Write a protein that binds this ligand. Structure first.
Ligand code: ADP
Lengths: 371, 290, 338, 262
């Protein structure tokens, strides 16, 4: 029983699993580490480069770099290393026996899809592989075929509306405001408290701090007044070396750059304004449904209170007669993969696979013919 | 929309509205009215509007029937539709002015000729009575049904009794000229503004266009009453009859006769957009206001 | 091509003296004129439909002469006294003729119960009225018509003898008056009930005309009799509405009139009729297990010169080049001792 | 809101073969079908109007099955032989059935001079044909129709005996054939003759049924006799006038007028 493989890639996270399963088998960060210190211990285990979950264990002696930034790959060799580690070390399955399903950002340059297809057929001898949109699969995971979806990952944020299973290409909006930039901003605003983080491992530590002790304020000025006038909004984080820091005021300051990019100084508008503009670009007749179905996707939208603030900010710009509701599934981190696990399981999808033999007469552009 | 959508049984009327949109009937303009009389210009409006209105209600059977009006400005003249053009496309400038004997005085805007045989009966009626200025001959599907029946018209409705005396002409159909004309002339003596042909159809005469239209509409309505009444019982089951003179006695600067309904139908025709240009006694539906 | 005409221009005109209930009555009685126009039963006004305004003061809403049923608006209608004199005139420039109102007045002096009168001149109704037999109970609609009275009409209702004869022969409890060789008259406590009866009479008249045309003789029609069973039409209009409580109780013609009047409101006829039963369209609800419920229900001054800064640093650097010796500032306490 | 359908669209295809003046005369049939939809006579698909193309080799034009009268175009017609087998199918992707053509084929096998055949199933003509009296001379249009022969109809013409019965029933000179309980059939040398005859026949049938329902007795109506009654184109002016409105309205008909008109 040959089953398809679903591999979801994003800048900072790679997931993989068999089609038709509830859970992905492998989840690990998309990191590549190379040793930085002088290695002098003859006879014990050293390697040229560490990748995946093993590299995150040895952050002290490694320089950690990401192959993908902003949804665009920078070094393809590191991407090959991650794919090889996923196919061999994590799942222990042959890549040339089972078909593989791949996802990417909607708006992207020409060369990315062609290079990805060329590498996936030539290196691993994949009999069939298909490319799909991430946000469309997230909407399929929610199980409604219509509505506007917001997927904000660690690489890039994008809102696409899908009506009757079609994503309108003109109404797609993309904003380069992700969680890694929020991590950098949190590091910059933690500088003024007296704690200094400069290395890449300290960036991962700051990211863990952001994941554990951040939340979204309903009213920004009132929360500033409360945090200035009282010490109730203070939590203590415990560093891996035993030191204790107090996060204090900054907890609602780092995620607020999502709504106001003037803190980062970005020219573009907020994420809620981006969603509102994407709704404005569509036809009037469907706008009701676009205001009726909106789901949140991505790990960046796991900040507490994101749904209430999003609903309030959309309702502020919306007409008074419109009804605004926001859907937030609890498993919004892994929705995209779940959608892939739906899409490969259908009986009409076996003809949707790209043929290995057809690529021989077509070439690397074949995906633009079929997808 | 060039063409209006058609009902399952009303396509021809929809095309009549479409042709009213496409071609206005007030073809005469300021520059195009050169060397033309004023009274004839006023009368062509009424005649063309009557041809346009006749096709809407269904009293039009191809080019076999004609509606004639008389203008007594010169010694001897009449107006008639040209032969070969249906009722829904008649304009004011396309009408043809001809003689009593059928001689074409002026060709008009159109090129097609005039049928003498259709105008023979109209000429007979016009030569019989000098006071008659309008003759309307129509063939409704119920009118030939009542006309071919033995007893004829009956006083069953107030519309029938509003007609008063009615003349009957037997359909011999030999149509040889002068003696047919004189049988028409003295089969319809003084008054008797409504004449019934036994098989050809119905015809009404009037001193004006509005009065003739009112008389022919009363005749059509009375015919529609009479058909449904006599269909159920046709004899000793006595349908209730009224004395003509006695019910007429009890029926019993003012508005002229026949102008009210005619002006209301002009209000329809202007509401649709036929652009009739008919002179209005009261051009405004409501009052002055601002 | 613009046959839409606003039926309620009372607020726009603002040039009339309306009574306590004219705002509802005028629209209510213009709606039935529009419905008579749409069904095509009558197009040219012969004073078909009349309304009674109030019982304390007998004023009656009638249509102006020379106005077609398509052109009827609520403000264009006029109100008159029972004698026939004009009390208040509508916003229509036409000569006033109240000749046909008198027969309607012959109804109003007899029965205080009736409030609206509709007269019909349709070919089928006139065929049935002129027929020797009346409306034969051969159809379900004729059974729903009910009892009725026949009277000979001769064109005048102005002398007292004809009026008292009509009021005597009409009877205390009769809803339909058939004028021989002239047509039918429907009486109504409410406009909806009278329109209901008008519709049922028209349907039954057409049915009778077709039936007696089809078969020669009455005995071939095997007619049933209303009298033998004597039903009270109980059990009609069983209702299971969700917004209101389920009751059988309804008037004779409300439910049919509400749908027609909402039809009229949908296109753009700005009617002022109040609906007893409000209607809402809403999107349908889901109970698939897939659906997830929603979570909720200066530093720098404004005016300055960079050239000032450049000239200042040039002034300082010039003193650097000259190397002029100058002591620092001295305190005022040390200035005292010198 | 889809707009009105053009009547002549054979220039768009330019793939079917054409013989002699077929480019004109095909359109004529389409006009006739459109005329039916203007009169409410028939709006459902049936074998109403068939036309012989040429006197030789027995080619005929029929309407496709399942196509309503409003949507018939010039290029959608179907060309068949006398046996009903399809010779040149039209540009209409519908299944073909020629079981209703057989009666018209029998009539065509009877008379070589007859070119156009019109069949209608309207209530007036069906009531007149079901009536044993037939068409009565109680109207002017009934006298304008002429003389007709009455034939009992079983419903199918596949039997040889019924065919030869049809030829000996039709006679040498006849233009109108009344089928009992089925209706009337108008025969014409051209489409104008058949249209004129069937229009006058329906007008006469409506007058007759109205008057006979009104009176209730055949002797209550007056009866006309034939003694009083008993370039050179009988019915081209009326069809040309209807053609003139069709061209002025927007229908793109290809009929050439006899005179330069305006
Ligand atoms: N529990 C959490 N709470 C808040 N933020 C989180 C949480 N988990 C992850 N994140 C943020 O989401 C980012 C990961 O997003 P991810 O869903 O991996 O994007 P993609 O899969 O498209 O690359 C991390 O950089 C982190 O900042």
């Amino acid at each position: 029983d040959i089953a398809a493989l679903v591999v979801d890639n994003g800048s900072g996270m790679c997931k993989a699993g068999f089609a038709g399963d509830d859970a992905p088998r492998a989840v690990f960060p998309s990191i590549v580490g190379r040793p930085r210190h002088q290695g002098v211990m003859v006879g014990m285990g050293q390697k040229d480069s560490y990748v995946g979950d093993e590299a995150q264990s040895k952050r002290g002696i490694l320089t950690l770099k990401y192959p993908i930034e902003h949804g665009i790959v920078t070094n393809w060799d590191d991407m090959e290393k991650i794919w090889h580690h996923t196919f061999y070390n994590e799942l222990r399955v042959a890549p040339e026996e089972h078909p593989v399903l791949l996802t990417e950002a909607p708006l992207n340059p020409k060369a990315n899809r062609e290079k990805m297809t060329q590498i996936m057929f030539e290196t691993f001898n994949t009999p069939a592989m298909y490319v799909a949109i991430q946000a469309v699969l997230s909407l399929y995971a929610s199980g409604r075929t219509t509505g506007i979806v917001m997927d904000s990952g660690d690489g890039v944020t994008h809102t696409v509306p899908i009506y009757e299973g079609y994503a309108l290409p003109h109404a797609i909006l993309r904003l380069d405001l992700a969680g890694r930039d929020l991590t950098d901003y949190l590091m910059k605003i933690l500088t003024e408290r007296g704690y200094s983080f400069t290395t890449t491992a300290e960036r991962e530590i700051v990211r863990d701090i952001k994941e554990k002790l951040c939340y979204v304020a309903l009213d920004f000025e009132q929360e500033m007044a409360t945090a200035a006038s009282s010490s109730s909004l203070e939590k203590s984080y415990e560093l891996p070396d035993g030191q204790v820091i107090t996060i204090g005021n900054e907890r609602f300051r780092c995620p607020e750059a999502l709504f106001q990019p003037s803190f980062l100084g970005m020219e573009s508008c907020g994420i809620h304004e981006t969603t509102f503009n994407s709704i404005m670009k569509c036809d009037v007749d469907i706008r009701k449904d676009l205001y009726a179905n909106t789901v949140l996707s991505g790990g960046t939208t796991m900040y507490p209170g994101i749904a209430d603030r999003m609903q309030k900010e959309i309702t502020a710009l919306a007409p008074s007669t419109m009804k605004i509701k926001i859907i937030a599934p609890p498993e919004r981190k892994y929705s995209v993969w779940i959608g892939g696990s739906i899409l490969a399981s259908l009986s009409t999808f076996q003809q949707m696979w790209i043929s290995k033999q057809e690529y021989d007469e077509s070439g690397p552009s074949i995906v633009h013919r079929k997808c | 929309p060039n063409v209006y959508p058609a009902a399952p049984q009303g396509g021809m009327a929809a095309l009549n509205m479409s042709l009213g949109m496409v071609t206005p009937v007030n073809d005469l303009r300021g520059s195009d009215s050169i060397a033309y009389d004023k009274g004839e210009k006023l009368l062509r409006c009424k005649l063309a509007a009557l041809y346009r209105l006749a096709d809407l209600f269904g009293w039009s059977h191809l080019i076999y029937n004609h509606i004639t009006t008389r203008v007594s400005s010169e010694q001897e003249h009449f107006l008639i539709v040209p032969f070969g053009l249906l009722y829904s496309e008649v304009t004011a400038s396309s009408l043809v002015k001809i003689n009593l004997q059928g001689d074409v005085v002026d060709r008009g805007s159109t090129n097609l000729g005039v049928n003498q045989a259709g105008f023979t009966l109209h000429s007979a009626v016009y030569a019989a009575r000098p006071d008659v200025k309008c003759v309307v001959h129509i063939h409704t599907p119920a009118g030939a049904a009542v006309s071919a029946m033995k007893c004829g018209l009956l006083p069953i409705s107030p519309e029938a009794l509003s007609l008063g005396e009615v003349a009957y002409h037997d359909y011999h159909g030999i149509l040889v000229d002068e003696e047919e004309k004189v049988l028409i002339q003295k089969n319809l003596g003084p008054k008797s503004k409504v004449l019934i042909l036994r098989n050809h159809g119905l015809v009404s005469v009037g001193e004006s266009v509005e009065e003739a239209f009112y008389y022919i509409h009363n005749l059509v309505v009375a015919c529609e009453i009479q058909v449904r009444t006599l269909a159920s019982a046709g004899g000793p089951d006595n349908l209730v009859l009224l004395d003509p003179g006695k019910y007429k006695a009890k029926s019993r600067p003012a508005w002229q006769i026949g102008e009210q309904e005619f002006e209301a139908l002009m209000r329809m025709l202007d509401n649709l957009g036929y652009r009739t240009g008919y002179p209005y006694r009261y051009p405004a539906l409501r009052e002055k206001s601002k | 091509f613009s046959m839409m005409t606003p039926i309620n221009d009372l607020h726009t005109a603002d040039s009339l003296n309306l009574a306590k209930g004219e705002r509802l009555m005028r629209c209510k009685i213009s709606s039935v004129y529009r419905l008579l126009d749409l069904y095509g039963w009558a197009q040219l006004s012969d004073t078909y439909v009349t309304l009674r305004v109030s019982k304390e003061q007998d004023h009656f809403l009638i249509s102006p002469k020379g106005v077609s049923c398509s052109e009827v608006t609520a403000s264009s209608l006029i109100k008159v006294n029972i004698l026939g004199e004009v009390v208040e005139k509508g916003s229509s420039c036409f000569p006033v003729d109240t000749t046909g109102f008198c027969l309607h007045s012959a109804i109003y002096a007899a029965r205080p119960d009736v409030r609206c009168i509709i007269h019909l001149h349709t070919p089928a109704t006139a065929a049935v009225s002129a027929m020797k037999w009346g409306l034969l109970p051969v159809s379900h609609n004729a059974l729903l018509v009910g009892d009725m009275a026949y009277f000979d009409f001769n064109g005048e209702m102005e002398q007292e003898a004809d009026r008292i004869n009509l009021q005597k022969c009409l009877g205390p409890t009769c809803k339909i008056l058939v004028l021989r060789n002239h047509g039918v008259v429907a009486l109504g406590d409410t406009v909806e009930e009278a329109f209901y009866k008008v519709f049922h009479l028209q349907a039954a008249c057409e049915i009778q005309v077709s039936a007696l045309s089809s078969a020669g003789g009455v005995e071939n029609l095997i007619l049933l009799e209303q009298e033998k069973h004597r039903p009270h039409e109980v059990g009609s209009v069983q209702w299971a509405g969700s917004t209101f409580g389920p009751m059988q109780k309804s008037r004779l013609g409300e439910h049919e009139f509400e749908a027609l009047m909402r039809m009229l409101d949908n296109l753009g006829y700005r009617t002022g009729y109040p609906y007893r039963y409000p209607l809402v369209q809403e999107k349908t609800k889901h109970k698939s297990e897939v659906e997830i419920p929603a979570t909720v229900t200066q530093f720098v001054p404004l005016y300055t010169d960079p050239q000032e800064v450049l000239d200042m640093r040039n002034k300082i650097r010039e003193q650097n080049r000259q190397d002029v010796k100058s002591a620092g500032p001295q305190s005022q306490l040390l200035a005292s001792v010198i």
